[PDB]
């Protein structure tokens, strides 16, 4: 990154103070918490299913949070339609290498690979990769029935666990089929409503493209720190030193390598706060998954506010998105 | 050369400081460990080597033990540039025929080794090792002459020197002394022992498995995935993409009847022929030759080179006339951006032209020659418009304006303009892989960033690019080349993750899998409200499960102008 | 090591502390272009104006290294603001008393938890029946 | 403190090359001035009134009048350098000082001077790695501590005498990134943190 194939400029890399040896440290450090968060988390994710299938009555939850099933075209699709529509409201960045890493992600092509390779920066998937995963499907699959069917199956149907579950919540005593169809109407319509969701109204849309700008303006800060010259005549080391003098050549030299150092090293510490932060958001994460998706939980508003009905969750760029469904008076 | 002793080199390694059992990579001009490149044959006389570098190197013959007796081993060698003149200097080094023999080492400007030079810098004799075998050398990198005879090294930097042809002779005994000439820039890894002295060597490119070695810096790789081993393309620069016309002429210096004031002419956007601006005669111009021979306009700059390597910004010359007392050029007070130089006008009356030439800003260049088309097709480091990138360029129809010779795309580099033709700039994703490896002798390859589908590296685009090693399998993580890729199977003990839930499984041979993970259960257990199945354990596994959190830290207090 | 992903999360800080040291020591061992670290050296031998360079290289050259330690100190300290309020937590729910909440202290139905102190932390041993 | 710029014995410099040409123009005569100890007065006559003007005010000798990038008083130890010399005749006592090169001092002193007749010398100081100094090092001090500065590394600390030995190629000794033995003319010392700082 710093010197491209100098080999003058390489033997003058030895006088800062480690420099390269730190980076080199820092950013592999930072990719072992990085996987040993995802590893935690997938584990926490994988889960049984019941052998017997119940059936959704009238709840629509799997045209909507499962798996699309192939069509007649040899076009596999992992994502389910919730997933996708969630890949396609984030707007763009422009050109550039940040937007067309993205436009590979969103298009999800089999067998292509979405790595890069750019002045000596490898750019490679984490250990599991959500983005190239239906959360419902595969070989990681997240369970569908858990947390309203529970862990000792036998249930057969939604309209027999969704009425349990209006019982345990106190709001009637023996649901009867009208109680039940106006919950399972009430599900589709809200449902149905998530494929409208805007940009400037969605505050979860919102949190997503914030994300996604942030990558793209990281981008550009690697991409501007080859490209600029710093005052140095060029940002060819050997035409430094062949048309200054002896002392204006090692002025201008520096100037390169120390202002190439200072974008490198500024990636670094804004990659090694991504991670620290992201330690204690996985323990969030998976306190969601164990106690208001997997299971009942009775912490208030802790899976939103209200009585709380179900919980399920979708792959987003870069992330997860949990769907917290409730009945406030 | 039939026998070289390669456990000699470990005593012309060194590094910077002493360091107790460590493992480092130093670079330098080094001797050659393929035998081949060395100089030992015996015959009826004394056969004379010749090479162009670098350095050389030399080992002397196992003396003890030999049949030798007395007679060692003389190794006369020179070093000299391509055109000996009264004006360069040269090397001079000879042992003589015996035991118990001062090296003599002379760096001389001769008129003719001779006996009488006109000056010396090293004119010294020295005792030498003969009761081992002796490894010894001298390197001129970049002017910088290093002398090296261990235990003693002699270093000095001489601007403008231009060493590059070597003559070496030896007298053959019972052997001979033999020698290897080194032309490039190495790197080697290097063990030492507790002393701070090497003891294992391996150089970087001898080979795939020493590149992999210097870049983990280790012997004894233990099997992993090791990632971004980079591929090294050659270069080209453009000082200028377009065609310049001939420059004017120099600037006439007889001024006719009076004093008068110098004539300024602009050099800028044009092509020189620096020897127009002499008389022609080789006698007038002389002290002007490079030891490479070729003719150079400076003998004295302010802040810029005075070696002109071929391509400079543009500028202002001024000339002028002056007399020589004693035959003294005396160079007059350069400002800073300004160079000078001078040749004989009329030499027997001491009259001499001289110019000076100020650097301005002129956004301008001044060459010596034009630029040539690219190669296309294959992937190069460019440096197009002060920018270096490295790429492949392909022939476009594509246009963009007149004004501009490069065109991006957000900032993004889409295309260039040489010599009025346009040219796509096309990523090069073969220049990083990684390294599956058990062995030695089995590993695998993946192109992390490469797509290698089968319509791709058929067609004439990839032809001057197809290695075989790109001929492998297609998948979501790349070009993967000699493992098996096996999609279906599955493993929930990954020791080797390759990222987006495969693994790579080194026990047998190389094979890329799946990862899975246990799935687990559930506390909750739904409320029964009707008569139906339910599904109760039998009995239970009792597990412990560790988790590690951080708590403390030292404190630090700092004293930060300590 | 290769095994345990808690003897790993160990090792990885214990890492991340040394790689931090040898920065610390390398920017005082090496000189940055100038021609020695020492300040008198430098002044006695060069000119006004090239002294000035000189030394500025060295003070930018050992304030950038230190501030870089600061720097990684305080992100180290930010992550532990929100790491121990997790960890009092896992004391007073899964270790002092008996949790309600499904997954807190592992998988399963819970038993028992103790805790061990570590190199720069605390182990917790959870134990768990599971069917 | 306690500075080496070298640690090893040095032997004497050569001649100052004279600068008599004999019969016609020449050019001048270099000589390489490099790992040695130095008598920068014998580059004189020696009597005092040809070299009055590179006298400092304490007193002492100095060889040079002027430098490009570099500071003319010397203290004590400089790099290795090239010395070319010649001679000229000022004009109404005026020694012009010529064009330097960047790295070059020079200075002149009298040789006829009722003749107005002057040696110069002009020293280039070119990348060598050795030293020219004008006195040998001593032995350390031991069992104190001292901010050294040996092999341009500064270091605080604690010399003891060692039975140790490493390569004579070296000076100094690291294990890891922690310097643990040096050895100033020829005896090897351990290096100890004082603790008590
Ligand atoms: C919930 O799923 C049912 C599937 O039975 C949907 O009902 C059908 O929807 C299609 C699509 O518009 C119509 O063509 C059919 O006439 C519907 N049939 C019946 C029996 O309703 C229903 O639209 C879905 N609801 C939501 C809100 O998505
Ligand atoms: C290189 O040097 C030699 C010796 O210094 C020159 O040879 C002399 O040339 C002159 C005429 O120019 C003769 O009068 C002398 O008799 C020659 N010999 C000696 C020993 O002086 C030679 O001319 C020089 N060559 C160049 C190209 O400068
Ligand atoms: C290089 O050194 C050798 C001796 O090592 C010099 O040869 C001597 O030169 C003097 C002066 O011309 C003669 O009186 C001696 O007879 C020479 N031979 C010896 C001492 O064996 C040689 O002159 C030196 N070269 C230069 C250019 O000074
Ligand atoms: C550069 O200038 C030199 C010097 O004039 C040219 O060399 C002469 O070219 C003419 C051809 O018209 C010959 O008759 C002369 O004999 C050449 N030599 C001299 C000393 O005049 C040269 O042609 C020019 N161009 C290049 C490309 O070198
Ligand atoms: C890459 O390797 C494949 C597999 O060996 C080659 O495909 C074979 O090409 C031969 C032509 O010599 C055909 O006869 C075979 O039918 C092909 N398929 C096989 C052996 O399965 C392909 O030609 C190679 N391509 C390049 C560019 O090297
Ligand atoms: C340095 O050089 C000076 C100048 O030659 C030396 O001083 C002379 O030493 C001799 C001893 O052989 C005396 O006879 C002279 O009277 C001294 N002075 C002069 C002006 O010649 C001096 O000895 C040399 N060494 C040191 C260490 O100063
Ligand atoms: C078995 C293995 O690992 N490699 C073999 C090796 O014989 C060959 O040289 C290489 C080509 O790259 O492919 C195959
Ligand atoms: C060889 O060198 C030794 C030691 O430097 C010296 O004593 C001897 O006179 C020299 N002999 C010759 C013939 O050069
Ligand atoms: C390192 O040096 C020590 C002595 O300092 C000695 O045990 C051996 O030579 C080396 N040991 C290892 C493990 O490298
Ligand atoms: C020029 O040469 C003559 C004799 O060749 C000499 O006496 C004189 O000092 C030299 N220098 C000048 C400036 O005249
Ligand atoms: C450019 O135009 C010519 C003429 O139509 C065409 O043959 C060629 O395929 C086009 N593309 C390239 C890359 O040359
Ligand atoms: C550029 O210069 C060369 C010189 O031989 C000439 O042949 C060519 O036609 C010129 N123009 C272009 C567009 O290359
Ligand atoms: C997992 O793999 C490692 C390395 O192959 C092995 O040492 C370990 O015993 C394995 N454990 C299980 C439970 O398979
Ligand atoms: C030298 O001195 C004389 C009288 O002492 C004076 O006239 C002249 O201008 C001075 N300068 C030169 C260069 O001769
Ligand atoms: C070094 O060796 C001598 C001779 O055996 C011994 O007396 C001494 O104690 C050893 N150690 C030191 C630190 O001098
Ligand atoms: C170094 O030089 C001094 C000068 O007096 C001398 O006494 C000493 O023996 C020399 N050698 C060593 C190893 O100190």
Redesign the pocket.
Known sequence: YICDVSKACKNLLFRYGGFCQKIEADIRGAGVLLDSDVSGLYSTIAAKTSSITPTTD?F?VS??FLPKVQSNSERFESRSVIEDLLFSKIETTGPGFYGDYYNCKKNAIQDLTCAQYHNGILVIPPVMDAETLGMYGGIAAASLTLGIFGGQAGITTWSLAMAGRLNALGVVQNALVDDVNKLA?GF??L??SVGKLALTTSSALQAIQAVVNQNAAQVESLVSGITENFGAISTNFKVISQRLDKLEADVQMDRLINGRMNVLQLFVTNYKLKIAELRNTHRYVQSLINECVYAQSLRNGFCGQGLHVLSLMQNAPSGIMFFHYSLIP | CDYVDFRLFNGIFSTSRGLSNTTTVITGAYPSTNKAKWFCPTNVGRPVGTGVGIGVYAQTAQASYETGGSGAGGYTFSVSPKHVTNLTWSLWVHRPWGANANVTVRLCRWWQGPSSAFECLVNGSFPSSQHKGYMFGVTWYNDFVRIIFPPTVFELQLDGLQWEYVQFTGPVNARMTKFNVVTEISSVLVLTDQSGAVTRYSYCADGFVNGLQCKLRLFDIPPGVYSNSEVEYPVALYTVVHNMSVCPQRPESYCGSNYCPFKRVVFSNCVVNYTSWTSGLLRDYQHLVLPNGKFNPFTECNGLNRIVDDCVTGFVLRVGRGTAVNRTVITPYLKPNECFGWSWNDYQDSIYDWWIADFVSTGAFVCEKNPDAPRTGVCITYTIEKVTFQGVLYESNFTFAQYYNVLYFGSQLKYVRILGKVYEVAPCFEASYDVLFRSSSSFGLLYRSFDCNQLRISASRFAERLLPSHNGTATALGCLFNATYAPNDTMVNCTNPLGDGFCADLLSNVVVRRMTFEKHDTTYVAPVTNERFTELPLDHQLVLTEQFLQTTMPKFSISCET
């Open positions: 009238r629509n045209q909507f109407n589709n319509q449902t149905a």
